[model samples]
Target: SLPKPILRVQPDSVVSRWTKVTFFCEETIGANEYRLYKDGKLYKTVTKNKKPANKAEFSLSNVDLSNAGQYECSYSTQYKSSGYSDPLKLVVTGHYWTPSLLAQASPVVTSGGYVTLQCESWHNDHKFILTVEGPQKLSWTQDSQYNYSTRKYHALFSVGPVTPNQRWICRCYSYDRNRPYVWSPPSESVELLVSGNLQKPTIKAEPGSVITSKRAMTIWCQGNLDAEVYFLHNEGSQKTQSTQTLQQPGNKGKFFIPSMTRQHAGQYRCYCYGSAGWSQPSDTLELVVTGIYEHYKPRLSVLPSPVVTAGGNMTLHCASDFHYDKFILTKEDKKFGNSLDTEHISSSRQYRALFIIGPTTPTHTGTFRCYGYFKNAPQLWSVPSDLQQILISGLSKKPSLLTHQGHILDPGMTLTLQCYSDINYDRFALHKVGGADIMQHSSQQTDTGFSVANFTLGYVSSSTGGQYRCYGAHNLSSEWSASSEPLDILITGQLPLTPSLSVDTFILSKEGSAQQPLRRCYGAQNSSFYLLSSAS
Candidate 1:
């Protein structure tokens, strides 16, 4: 019987590696010979005459794949017979014959640049131990960025600012509790022969067809294509391009121009040149500019009332059909006016040019024209329209009462007033003779003539009750038209409301007869009070 064999080497491995196998002798006899057997064949012999007091060891170094097999030791002396112990396994590790690997960042280094080598194992939850042995080297452990959930490990190794003629070899050790640690054979060795660093070149600015201060623009450049650095040129001068550099290790390189300006605006292009190669020039790019003007005008149109009436309001409109390059509105011999009244309702496509008076007087009438101003050109104006004439004839000047009550009114009562102008002019004007300031409401078109309707004291109280008269003027002049006789608005405080009737009839005839009884009717249903006590 013999002592259990101590682990010296693993079995079944690859070739051309520096591996070692060891075995120990438990006991020894004097004048005995120790021999090593491999695969049941004698491989090594050590002869000694004296007994060994402690365990003796046998070691095999720098083994090859052919050295893999079972190995054991036997001892014999003059006093005892030789006996062999149990065999111990010997394994020789392999080298990269057909190895593959992936690295982070890149595998090849741009001179004065960087490259990353990340260790990834085929096995899950396998701890990868990385070793870099090369002229230019970097190393790290797989536990970095390792995910326990996925049972994967990674090691990112990088090296740069590289010198010339450097060969690199990468090897990884992967292990888990599930199995014995297996070292991945060294990766296929690779080398980079560094030459002179090229001067980086790039496309300075990619220009636009149309350019402006308000619009956005971009220009960019790149390098490492026979050029290691980039230079920008314009107006017979060379300088660095204004941009940020980006690393695109796979395709080449990248540069970015975030924004562009007028100062940076010019004939833009790229020039690629290296320390050893000739320069390469790119095609020129052109830019167009905009946003130098104040306003834009599209088109203009005019609208006119069919006929002009004396003392009547007439409106002319100026409308725009498109965006304006510039806008300026002018009356004949008038300064520019940009008012809503002057500009008119945009959606209505009509601007009101109001003529409030139409006496046809020399001072009140004149030829008119509108103008539009544009950039990069002289002003444009519409042709002068014909001068207008205003005339007033056979019109009355007497003012007449329009309020029906002659003096009294009531709350919640709507008052209606009527005025008549017996004249040929198309326009008319009405004015109040007494009471609060006369406010003019809007006028409307009627079959006979235009009517000016005002809701007088809609909820009539004593505050709204007053004497009012209407005086009509010819649309072409200040001459008055025939006005109806006077009427008054009165607030009669009465219940079982009595309708007080006050009427004036004019007898204009050769044989005039008078005395039309204006009746005052009282309603017994209304419980109210008062009558015309003080008749003036």
Candidate 2:
């Protein structure tokens, strides 16, 4: 019998436009095919042969209004089929910042050639007004096409056959159904250039169609003999000149990506400009960015150390060898919900995301794990990273601190303090009040399961005289024991009561034939007092 399938989403239960989301389905039993359902309707089906783990991933890019709904999934084996999974809801919310509007062109035509300019966003089906600032200022609401699968809405403007060079600066604005005057901020401006007799360039990506985040890759744009200047355009950003030239074989320019990131993943095309003008756009290239999940798993760790003081800031880092744009931080056992952090860090080609919790309280302490994913598909993530526990302590019962050599210490003398607790703990920390320094030491357990740690202060000075406290905690604790009662150390310049040296008294022998004397030598407390007697 097959088990019920499990469905999940990446980033969060709620999402915004202009970003990617992924849905994943998994089952413990074997399966040959998977079917995804949206709102109880069959949305898509996937068939797999020689599959492992009976899992499948479905990605939705540039999510928008139409994507808000409930989703479920089921899997089937060659011999049997499974029941549908419990429905999962996805809430499509507006973004804090408006999605950036982008302008793109296909077959950038000139000299009687045909071309189309597309102004698009992940915004919902609403009025999109395109404004062009060029030789003539023009404004209009072009017809848009909606892709249910991609959740993207775009308006297309087409033109043909130009004799003279022309420049058009364009932008778009969006409005919702009820808000007539309230419009989204204008998108970034774009320039469309048309020149006569321009020859288009051929674009190709090196390595392969799919480039993992950390790997080095290059895109080449090849053109005719007269084409010298070349530009490579990413989907959202303006054009950038090629970094270097390709030798012989063909006249080409190259764009090098030393380390790939979500910012680098998108549709790409190239153009060339010669004496004639800018050439038609190159064939579009879809660069899919992925992570190295097969070789390395994601890792989760806390920043500024695992132990956090109450009201202090705490940060958790989710790291992976591959570039992943989205991360989900979740505490164990939750209908308690989760957190989303899309900001990513790329170093040496690897990716890391930071999840920050500030002014944390005892309620915030818990075991947490971070899940990493590509921006295009959030549902599919790297295997959940290792767990990191955070402990918050400020008002908890602290360990007792006792000085072996008394609290009052003379200059240059050593101080030894034992911090112990009836409650068993893996380690202990000694902290000096009003100072930034903290000393940590592991503890040994006694027959009664009591834990104790010995902290030694090698030398004593006036600076050492201050309020001190100790804390005890286990290796996996999210919070330490309550602080112990504070102890005050008093540093004195006067000699300690226990003198460093001593002299032994001698007894006279009664009626001895010869007068014999006893001699003895004494040393400091740390050394053996040597006694020697001789007849004199």
Candidate 3:
């Protein structure tokens, strides 16, 4: 027969922020340290003494990933250890924030213009399930992260020229064990509309010069017709232009050109088209050609802006020689959350990182991202590039856990104990000189800036009075030398001269070159409380 492995907790998985896992072994007799093995590997040694004797309440705190997998708790001695328990698998899970784009690469129309949207997702979004849905029809898939599976489906009907007057929607959903699957805001509706040749589009130069004459003058082409638009320019040879797809679903269109010359300047027109054909263009617009010096080439430079509240508006201005196409604002660390890109800046090329505190809440604290574009390319950034240390005001500051002043009680009251770090100092110690016993405690966080500790003691008495000391430290230090002056607390409700008498009698008489026990006279006509004080 085999030695049955007795473990209260069998193989299992768990999630925790602290890198530690705990379990128990039934038989903990004569054990020195618990030897746990992971996947046939020597994981680590956990001191058995650290746990209460006889009971196998094993703990693996301050642990790392190496602590994951099969575990074998065993008994060991100074020279050698013995393995007994069978391999127990332990799985570790955690939360990770990963974001990617989901979109349709191409669409195929089957019959009667019944569009077949070929949808696919991008980036390695493993460990997640994804789905695409509309108001009526939806297509979903699971375990997408593993097999990179892509699902396809039809919206059931066709949308025509009634789009601007109607609406269509597309949305994506992501699923994680930590949080329920969240459906992103619907993508722009797929509107069905009639397509027609656009009329001559109009171009209003920056100077409001209508029908511009200067050749090769760059201009921003915008129209209010469809989901996307195309531009046409009259080159001396044939028509030459550029086409771009805008992510923003609704609203007007915006496009720009880099440099323009006499031959490159002429009647420039724009036509809007998407799930439909081109809509009518506005009046033909002319471009005023001018030297590059005339146009402002926009660039960007971030100032030494502190994410602090003092600098009212943390703005990023897009410097451009001419008007820009679009600006995007995003945070590099999605570890917090995602922020969408918007054409927020219109009047000026600047955006503000504003913070307001009212009805206090935590939703107000976090990092932020800002992104935008100039004539050339767009930029994404994480301002301050570090986690913003946000502090909330107006909370009632609580008293500390244990407070003391060396040799000085607040009111000479035995029960007058103060909380440590109530205002200053962190590590604290409480000592009883009579018994030579000491208790210690400490709390610390990043950079060990500040913290709070709360403690409560019951059944207060004169004997409970001793010395409580507050000490400042880098962390939980065993040997404490540097600290605030130790505070002294004295309890006087009990026998007043009891401590004084003990100090002068046994404690003092036993000093160096001391003599034998001296005889003493006592009158106990008062009460036994007098004898109790002497013994205490």
Candidate 4:
């Protein structure tokens, strides 16, 4: 009993007329010559092959209408002739046009999720057949529906409950109701991949996020190991530069830019199917094209004052002489930041943006800077302005400053400067009239229930004598209360709180009566009054 052979055909199962197709008849028997059968009858025969390996090829090119039919093959060996092989069908396409099949979103899907596909045709296709060819071959027939926007007759097919390990290839065909078995040319195949739960893709910019014009750059993404495609999308406001491309097969890939211009400055996001996932959209990356202008910086000023009242509103005016489309405001010491479009100010003849930062709090105190940018190249910027510091004040009741005593007798002349308040202040600051930053110290609470900070004043010298003030603040906030009353600290010729005994006004300080004045003064003119004590 001779076995049946198998036959397969190419370039495609269905193709346009006049195209070439080759059919291979494969057999394992002891066969010699082979015959091709068309429509159940012998159409052609090869009596002997030049170098036969039990498989023979029958090809047709510049084929015609008669070439579209079911075909089979038989072979004969020295023993006997084999039965016909299974029938293979071939078609010459083009009575009705092939429709297009595409995914509505992207082809990447989450586990146990569904996907929507648009199978469309412009021809008179009454219905469509969407075929899923994969490990599990299935097909769905949808009645052609019309779309007003695209002006195409289409079918929206929702497929899935899709799962991983079973990637699918999908094809669509248009059909007429009158001839149920006949179909128009098949559409281009589409592919879809399913993932178990995709983590959000990681994104980074190559050569750095701060790129310059005429330089090369790449935006890269790392996602599922199964990713096959990648897309780079320019986000928010511009539509001219989105890209989608197939990636080298793997978990990560990059979008290459040969050379970029100022227009490349923008916020961008990348996607994958094996390009994008639902919960896996890549983080937004910004392309900042460095300077195109010189020192055209914006001037930033804070009003009423940089020092703001905690409960009041503060405004930052960012202006530029040369017109720019907008301004960016960034807090130098913290994460606070913002951007605003520029407005023409006729009074100042400059373009400006005002940022109202308030109904305030202690957190509002920070160093801020601003820059000018154009809308066309949003990532490109001018030089930043000199830093402006905003300070918050009047957060709590003010403290009191005093030298403890009936103004200190023993005229003993040593005095401790103390800052105290009925309200609790975690920190107390001692400031000199001419100094920039205060000397701040954490305060202690006394038995009297008032917070006080005692400042030790050592032997005074010309270099240490100055008019002083103090302030109080809570540790959690960057704000200060009103300053305490001014306390004068005039230094006389002194030693550890003891005045000089000799008229020379040197350190030969006298140990005198504890409750007495530093000296007995004697001078012709009150202009240079003197204090001298007897050398006992």
Candidate 5:
């Protein structure tokens, strides 16, 4: 059996203003912890000290009208807890005249329908003010009206076309005719419940119903323009709901997920509240997020190349091998601008689209990709292409390319090269002759205002030998600095084998012994050779 705590209060029946009160709790078991509850919510917690007795106490230095309420206590050990004891009612007695407040409404009202609240007082011919507390606060004042048949004075208040799920309470208070500052006690709280034709809302997902785990997306809830609130629910492994009170001028609620993940995959629905209670659930939408989509993505390329300078215009070209009706360019998963109609290039018999950003600023630099779809199936888009990075140059000082190794290197040796700049820069680009950039690397700054990036080549061969240069720019720049002086690298290896050697016979000289044959040597020789002759 669970243990029940015993509660004791000084002046158990009533409390006078400024009176000191003590609430003492005791349990039969030696539970070290005891909790006090006021009207179903925890008010305070106390602990029993070194005493052998299982008891704790709470004291009030001064009692006021606000202290009146029902209280209960429970005891608990480290491993076990007990149910609350019978409740004790505490009432504070005050000298000032306290007015009683009453609130009344129809027992039942249709959802999104209005109901009248009648606030009454025992005293007749008194002015009263009514206030309601709920999702928001509302207050109004009116003189009491005397009913001839019931012999009662009351004031009527009208509230809502309210939702059934919304809970609120009303109370009333009045000023004393004799004392300007003294007011009557507030009324007992009355709840409002609405019933009737609730509505169902419609929902949609932006960027299409399907999303990639790493991309961001938005979901919209649409209902009557008069709707005051909307809710989004996810029916997945873990059920969740999000609520929004403020909506756009149009009857729609937009919820954004900054970044999607596998956990977000689920069936989604929405409901909204109007004058009537809640509408019926919206049509469910399935959100499928497995991984990135890598199907027949449109080819993305930059006009004038991927390089740009500040204050210049850059156009991006997205071409598809097959015919497409529409195309879209996105920067970092966000739609760059409005979708563009695909132009059929008769010469190439392919579909192409263009997006232009002019007077490009540092902000224009970002990773971009494109998508295409047929007009008949606007919602169905092809997979995304590889991300192409756009570079904006001239934001920092130029960088110089330098190498510790000489112009020549043996095959199969490692080489380390540095791109250094005196000016502050965020990234460095290294380019080889007769080809696109070999690689680009971000830079790290030093205390001496020098920024550098190191490029390493392992197992060098003839292919790796080249004339390389570098440029530097800050991340925000629309153009890079002029290329550094080229550094040439060469690879050396073993010489080729010889082909053949021959000697030409010469006519006899005055002395036969002096005669010598001209020697000739030929082969795919790699090294130089010398010849000598004997003379008398």
Candidate 6:
């Protein structure tokens, strides 16, 4: 048998069935007679008399669902005949209309980050198919997001923890249930731009990311002199949106914006290119445009306290005297944030919004701030509030908390709790299970080599009666040690005038007189008393 001829569908194999397409049967050993076969049936034949070249073209104009099948071809020379080539599936998009795919980032990414593909079609594309166009024929599909309105349909596809070093181009098409394989034309292709493994540059905004609108700002990129050019990416909107700046100085690239607008607020990064190739991109810069309510700012406060045990939720209350329709809470140094409706409280006389966060992990340990904005104009913002931090415990090894006094104590006695561990923790904090205070102290190393911290609570009163745990932390690390086992400190002193001490709860009169008794206690007064019938 002679060598097999190569068969390929011209233009694209996956296309609307009604559209005309071509197939080529080619062999390098000098073809004379060429034949095309569909599903083992001889579909077309071409002799050397019809073509002068080594390849033969088989074009189909009235393509249909009946024409879709496994395709193969063979070419015969003057001396020998070739076996049929490997089969290629001619998949038909039985339907008409293609969907547009918009890459949510610069057509690029690194192996660490990801890209989002938004596919949209006006023809009510109920499903989307995103194919990575190549020899391997890889593709992804998703259910389109449908709304009450029949006019618009879309699908958001997330691609990657981007794998390395390849053109991440995408072709998007759509279909409905009636003919799942019948697809609309794939939108123009989009690339997932990924920077290669090179030195990363540093990027900074001259006036900081958050600046007044109409003000001037510049993004500066600093890499080594190996950089010959630099490009500024605005999280990018498909292709041709990034600006290529000729590298300035020996190693700097400066992008100057004469005036800022609300549209200028977004994610940005810079990449430097040279002989060795493009450098890894700089960290994303989140530029913010603000101005309208420069004098009015929001206030933020954490409920209970900011220190929380593992997997506990924290609430941040943002309030303002001004009538803001919404409030936003954002963590410093990250991109994600929450916008919540600000409700006006008649009793509190303020407009406030609560942001509930956590089931926290160590990742939630960071500073946070809030801003106030009106509904009509969201991009414009009020002045931001003072930044606050949240500290989370239970990420490190556990510590032991104990008291010199056992679990029970009287009202008049003072007490001290000791938190200790083998690890030389830089600081220790004591927490009362349901109370609002977290007392912390720098730790001291003992002679036998353990770190200890002591909290000398003034008196063992009802306020000090509760469950307790303590945590350890190093000064430099963001995480705190696991909380020690809980210790329940109970108050057991009671009062009665005549026989033995009595009554689970009661009240008292003046000193040295006599103690009065009440049948029940609500939530407020928790007074523990021990009477000798007289103190002396």
Predicted structure with the largest lDDT when compared to the true one: 6
Candidate 1 segments whose C-alpha is farther than 4 A from its true place: 1-100, 110-114, 132-140, 147-152, 159-161, 169-173, 176-181, 186-536
Count clashing residue pairs in model 1. Answer: 49
lDDT, each prediction? 0.42, 0.64, 0.37, 0.67, 0.64, 0.71
Task: Return the top candidate by TM-score.
Answer: 4
- The whole-model C-alpha lDDT of candidate 2 against the native structure comes to 0.64
How many residue pairs clash in each candidate at the backbone level?
49, 10, 47, 6, 17, 12
Against the hidden reference, what TM-scores do the models get?
Answer: 0.22, 0.28, 0.20, 0.49, 0.41, 0.42
- Residue pairs with backbone atoms closer than 3 Å in model 4 (clashes): 227-274, 271-275, 272-275, 272-276, 273-276, 410-514
TM-score of predicted structure 2? 0.28
Cα lDDT for residue 179, candidate 1: 34
TM value for model 3: 0.20
Q: What C-alpha root-mean-square deviation, in Å, does candidate 5 show against the real structure?
A: 21.4
User: Can you give the lDDT of residue 395 in candidate 3?
Assistant: 27
- Superposed on all Cα atoms, model 2 deviates from the true structure by an RMSD in Å of 28.3
State the number of backbone clashes in model 5: 17
Global lDDT for candidate 1? 0.42
Pairs of colliding residues, candidate 2: 22-378, 22-379, 390-478, 391-478, 391-479, 396-482, 397-482, 398-482, 398-483, 398-484
* Residues 1-536 of candidate 6: C-alpha lDDT, one tens digit per residue: 67778898976767576778899987788867888888888889888782488788998887887676778998778867667899987767645566778876556776667788888887754778888855676778898886557566888888766544444568888777676545676688786656867888888887777666788988888776766666667752213223354454546677788887766766777755566755687898767666558777788888657777778888888999998888887677342366799899999999989888777777776677788877766555677778766668877778888565654456778889999988889999888765645678999888989899989998766566777888888988768877877775655443334332324433322322122223212111233422212121
Provide the lowest-lDDT 10-residue window in model 4.
Answer: 522-531
Residue 96 alpha-carbon offset, candidate 1, angstroms: 14
Off by over 4 Å in 6: 9-22, 28-30, 38-43, 58-70, 77-83, 90-127, 133-137, 142-158, 176-181, 187-197, 202-260, 271-280, 283-536
Model 1: per-residue lDDT, tens digit, 193-297? Answer: 223343333443344433333545555555454444433444322234322345454113343335434444445445443445424344454332333332432
Candidate order by decreasing lDDT = 6, 4, 2, 5, 1, 3
